[PDB]
Write a protein that binds this ligand. Sequence first.
Ligand SMILES: C[S@@](=O)CC[C@H](N)C(=O)O
Lengths: 142, 148
Amino acid sequence: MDLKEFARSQMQAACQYLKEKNPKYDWVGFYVLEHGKLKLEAFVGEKTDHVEINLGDGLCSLAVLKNDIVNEYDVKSNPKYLASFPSTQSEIVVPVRYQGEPIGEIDIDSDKKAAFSKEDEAMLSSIADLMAPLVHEFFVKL
Amino acid sequence: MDLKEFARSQMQAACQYLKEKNPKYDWVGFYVLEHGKLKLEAFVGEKTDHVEINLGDGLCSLAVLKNDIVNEYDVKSNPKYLASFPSTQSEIVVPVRYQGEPIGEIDIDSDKKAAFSKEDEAMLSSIADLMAPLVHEFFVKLEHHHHH
Ligand SMILES: C[S@@](=O)CC[C@H](N)C(=O)O
């Protein structure tokens, strides 16, 4: 076995759990920072064209640059960003940290408007902390 | 908790990976310290009778009491310990630590003798460390009236 593949299977199980337990969560994935770029390493839902994201691009980049939650309750009334899927109406990006710094993120899309409450935020923050040591196996610094 | 149930599914997925990816690993479980006793919170394999374990003489206790890996190469030929399964010939218990202190463990049985090498030990220590926050969601400190 391998610690990277072990971490992948945990991150995959977490995506699966979050999707199955929350009716409104339509797509769930973990992006990790590798050589300055965000790379998708685990997900559940339909396939995304955006497997690698250069920074500056979107809610995904923004969560890492501000080092905080970005919760967009109406993706489609926000003329400064496009989701990856046409059905998506809200999206939340939660940072995963190592020694206080973002190394990755959990990214979730809902087909419903304003899907993510402040209670979702607190829970997802808690999950990000709990998964951090796992997600870190994928981090490759600049 | 929603988080406890999330943690339990992570631990469960970890036991499944451990058992599927390692041919000698026949039973995998996470025991967690809850009010000063070990409680099995996730496992893959055959049912065990040892769901709650008082701090005692077994390998499961030893890892927590010594705070170190306990690796029995030959269970049947150790007349001081009994396994949970008659097929077991080797067993390793790896402490799960949170802030330097043991809060639980990973217990693995093999039907083969001397199943657990130094490589296994080191990989399982790493695994235990990566899983610790999650196992910690089940951790509960023993608190008696006289403590405060
Ligand atoms: C795969 S999709 O959830 C990633 C792109 C993200 N919507 C963004 O706004 O950055």
